[PDB]
Amino acid sequence: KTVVVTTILESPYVMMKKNHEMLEGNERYEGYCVDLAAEIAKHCGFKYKLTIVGDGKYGARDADTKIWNGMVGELVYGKADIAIAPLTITLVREEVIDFSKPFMSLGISIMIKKGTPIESAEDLSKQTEIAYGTLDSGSTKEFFRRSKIAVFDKMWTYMRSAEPSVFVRTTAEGVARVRKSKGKYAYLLESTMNEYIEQRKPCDTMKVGGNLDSKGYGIATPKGSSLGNAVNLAVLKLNEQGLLDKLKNKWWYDKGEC
């Protein structure tokens, strides 16, 4: 059978090719997770179909309804066979889906418009003039929600209550807000994504200070799935045969415009 892969439009992981309209199926897309999906599939020996997650989300459990949305929900409810995406490995997700060993490491980080007087999370926590926020429905938000670290607690106490909202629907909306806000909005996002944007025109953002945590992205499968074992072993193999480092270089450092 053809394996249905859920993924998400998130640069440089999965992007539409400039000429996507002239192309069909898997050929419409390019990026790190596109290349990684093709390699996983070849090695494990299956055909596949890339499908972009319908609600545009990573995945969270609605606290009232109890339903999982996003990529996670496509797995949970049987709509997709695997997620190959910058999907963060978390405890609450690992309770309902399986993850491979991580294919890429990352931490939450700070994106500023260049010149903004902010060097750290501690600096953001101690002031009010520059607003800051996270993506509205993923692992970065949940991190703040849950932290007992005083600086991050203090940051959440401000973000959860700030008006108008400091949360954004997509990474791209966060980045555009940093860029348009004259130094007055800073964006909390994964280092991977921060570092990619920092090397793209108009070259007006930068990553500041250390990462706030350490984690990784994994390949996800529905709980129990037979595909999970093989996919895990393919991730390990591909790191060890150097493929993962090669794809990082291809999609980050070889694509630098700054």
Ligand X SMILES: N[C@@H](CCC(=O)O)C(=O)O
Ligand Y SMILES: CC(=O)N[C@H]1CCN(c2ccc(C3=NO[C@H](CNS(=O)(=O)C(C)C)C3)cc2F)C1
Binding residues for L-glutamate: 86, 88, 93, 139-140, 190
* Exposure class string for 10-28: b at 16+ Cβ within 10 A, else e: bbbbbbeeeeeeeeeebeb
12 near ligand X (CB under 6 A): no
Instruction: Please state the closest distance from residue 25 (CB atom) to its own copies, in A.
Output: 31
Site for ligand Y in 192-221 (CB under 6 A): 214-216
101 binds ligand Y, rule: CB under 6 A: yes
Q: Closest Cα to residue 49, out of 76, 22, 78, 80? A: 80
Among 6, 139, 191, 205, binds ligand X (CB under 6 A): 139
135 contacts which partner out of Zn ion, its own copies, ligand X, none, CB within 5 to 8 A by kind? ligand X
- Beta-strand ranges (E) seen in the chain are 3-7, 15-16, 29-30, 48-52, 82-83, 97-99, 104-106, 108-113, 131-133, 185-190, 205-208, 215-217, 220-222
Tokens 């998130």 locate to: 10
DSSP reduced 3-state for 16: strand
Of residues 25-54, those binding Zn ion (CB under 5 A): 39
- 64 makes contact, choosing from ligand Y, Zn ion, ligand X, none, with CB < 5 to 8 Å by partner type, with Zn ion
Instruction: Answer yes or no whether residue 62 interacts with Zn ion by CB under 5 A.
Output: yes
Q: What is the DSSP letter of 127?
A: -
CB of 152 to its own copies, least distance (A): 9
Which part of the chain contacts ligand X (CB under 6 A), choosing from 39-47, 80-88, 116-124, 247-255? Answer: 80-88
230 binds ligand Y (CB under 6 A): no
Instruction: Give alpha helix (H) positions in 114-219.
Output: 121-125, 139-146, 150-159, 171-180, 191-198
Query: Judged by CB under 6 A, does residue 32 bind ligand Y?
Result: no
Burial class (CB in 10 A: 0-12, 13-18, 19+), 240: exposed
DSSP per-residue string spanning 84-117: -SS-B--HHHHTTEEEPSPSEEE-EEEEEETT-S
Q: How far is the CB of 236 from ligand Y (least distance, A)?
A: 5
CA atoms within 13 A on the CB side of 63: 2
Pattern 118-157, its own copies, x by CB under 8 A: -------------------------x--xxxx--------
Q: Binding residue for ligand Y (CB under 6 A) from 147, 181, 225, 239?
A: 239
CB of 126 to ligand Y, least distance (A): 28
Among 29, 48, 58, 196, binds ligand X (CB under 6 A): 58
User: Of 64, 89, 93, whose CA–CA distance to 76 is shortest?
Assistant: 93
Using CB under 5 A, which of 21, 24, 64, 129 touches Zn ion? Answer: 64
CB 5 within 8 A of CB 24: no
Binding site for its own copies (CB under 8 A): 89-91, 94-95, 99, 101-102, 105, 143, 146-149, 213-216, 218, 232-233, 236-237, 239-242, 244-245
